[PDB]
Symmetry: C2
Subunit: 336 residues, 2 copies
Amino acid sequence: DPMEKFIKQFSFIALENIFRELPNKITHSFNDINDIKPPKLMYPIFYGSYDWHSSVHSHWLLVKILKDFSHFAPKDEIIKALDSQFSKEKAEGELKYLQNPAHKGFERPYGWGWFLKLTLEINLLAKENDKAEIWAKNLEGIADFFVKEFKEFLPKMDYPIRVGTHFNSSFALYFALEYARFKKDQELEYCIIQSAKKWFLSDKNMQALEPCGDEFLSPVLMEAVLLSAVLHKNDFVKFFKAYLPNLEAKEPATLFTPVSVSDRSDGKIAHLDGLNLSRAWCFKILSNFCDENLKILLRNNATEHFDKAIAHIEDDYLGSHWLGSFALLALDVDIL
Amino acid sequence: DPMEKFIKQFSFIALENIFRELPNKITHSFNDINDIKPPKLMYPIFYGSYDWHSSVHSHWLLVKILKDFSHFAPKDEIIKALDSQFSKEKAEGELKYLQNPAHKGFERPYGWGWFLKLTLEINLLAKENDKAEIWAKNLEGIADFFVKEFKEFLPKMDYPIRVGTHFNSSFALYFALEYARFKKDQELEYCIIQSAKKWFLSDKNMQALEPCGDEFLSPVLMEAVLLSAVLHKNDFVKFFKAYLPNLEAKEPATLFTPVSVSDRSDGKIAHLDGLNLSRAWCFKILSNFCDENLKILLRNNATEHFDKAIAHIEDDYLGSHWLGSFALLALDVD
C-alpha cells in the first residue's frame, strides 16, 4: 500500500525514460569513421534514459513492476511498450553492436550485470505470463553474449575494481551470480565465487574512506553484499564481524551519516542521491546476517538513508533517468 | 645519451598519436541529435591519440621534449606539427565545444589538469622560443576556461575522488596547482589548497587497498604528492610519517610490489603498465621528503616499478597512445 504511490511514480519515470531520446551520453569506441550514429540507430532498444546501461535497468524496473506490482501499475501500457521494444529485429541490432570487435569492452561490467538482471527478471515473469516468454527468447542472444564475456574476462582479473561507480566489480557480479544460479550455469557461478574469494577474503577491519564525490555505491558495503551471496552463512557471519567490527558502535561514522548532495544539476554529484538509496539497499541485505541489535540498527540506518533521497528522484533528468531503479531495490529487500 | 633512445621513442609515438585518427573513443554528451560528429570535426586539435585527454598530454609530451630535450628530438618536424595544430582557428573550435552547455562536465578533471599542464609547458617554452608564444596565446582562452571551471566546481566538492583512474582529484589538482602558481593565480591556488586540506588532512595510517584492475594511478601516493605541494615542507614531512607509517618496513607490501599486467590487449588492464610508471614518478617525488633510509628505499622501489613497464609502452596502441607521457614524467623527477 505504501508501494502504490511508489509503483505509480516508478512506472511513469521508467516509461518516460525508455523512449526519451534527449539528452543523451555515449561512451563509444570505433575503428571506422562511419560508425558514429545517433543512439536510436546504434542501440535499437536501449537508446533512451540518457545512456545504454540506465535504459537497460529502466527496462528492468518496468519488468519487475509488471511481475510483482502489476495491480499498482499501468500494466497494459507497460506490456505494449515492452512488446515494441523487445522485438527480435531490435535485439539483433543490439547484439550486432555488442559483437563488433571495435566495441570490445563496451559497458563492462555495469551494463553486463544489469542486462543479466533484466534477463533474469524477464525469465521469472515468463513463468507467469506468456508475453514475457517471447521477450526472453528475443533477448537470449544478448544475455549469452554477456555470459561469454564474463567467462572470458574474469580469469584476467588479478585485481578487483572497488570504486563505488559503475565500474564496481561487486555490483555487477552480484546480479551475474543471481543469473548464473537461476540458469544453473555452474561454470559462471564458480568463476564469480573464486574471483570474489581471491580479491576479498583477506579484507578485514575496513577503513571505509567513503563517500567519494561521484559514487552511487558503497565500496565496503557492495563488497560485503557480494560476499554474503558467495560465502556460506556462518562463514559470512564470521567474515562480516571482522570486516566491519565496530558497526554496533556506529563506526565508521561515515556509514551512519547519509551523504550530502551539494548540486543535483551536476551529473557526477547527483550520483550521491543514488548512494543513499543503494546504502539502504545494501544495509537491508546485510541486516539479515546480523545479531538482533545490529540487525535493527542497520534497518533503522537504511530507512534514514532512504528517506534522505526518495523525495529527490524526480528533481531533474540527471537523477530521474536511473534513481527509480535503486529506490525499488531498497524497497524490495525481504527483511527477515 | 641514456635519454636519447627514450626521447626519440617518445617523439615517434607522440607525433604518430596526435595525427592518428583511428581507433578512437568518445565520451560525448549532447542535447541535439546533429551534435554527433567525427572527432576531427568535434575536436579540431585533440581528435587523435585515441581520446581527447590522451591527445592533450601527447601534445604536452612533444612540447616538453621540444623545451628540454631538443637535441635528441626531430625538432623541426615537431615545430611544424605543433604549428599546424595550435592555430587560433582550431583552438576556437575546441573552445566552442567546451563552452557548449550540452557538454557540461566534459573531461573533468583529467583533461582539465593535463591541458593546464600543457599550457604551463608552452608558456615555459615561450621564454626560450618565439613560436611557442603564439601557441600560448592561441590556447590561452581554453586555459582560462578550465581555470574558471575549476573555480566553479571545487566549492561544490564535499568529497574528493580517490580512485586511481582519470577521475582522480589529486592528479588533476597537482598539475592545476603548478599552473596556478606559475600564473600567480592566487584565487585558484587558494581554492586547490583549501579543498585538499578539507578532503585529506585527517587521513592517516592508510590501508592502501591497491591496485584495482583498471588504475594507472595509486590513490595513496597521488594524494600524498598533492599534499607535498599543498603543505609546507615540515608539515608534510610530519603528515607523511603518519600517513604511511610502516614504509621503512616495506608496508603495505602492495606498494613495494610492481603490479601485474595480465593482458595488454585489454584497454583497462593496460592501465596497469601506467600504474607502475606513475608509482615510480610518485615514489621519486615523495623520496625528497624522507629520511636517508626511506629515501633510498623509495628510489630503489621506483626504479623497480619503472623497469617493469618501460619496455611495454609500444606493445600496442592501447598502451602507446598515452604511456610515453608517464614514462617521461617518471624520468623527469629531479
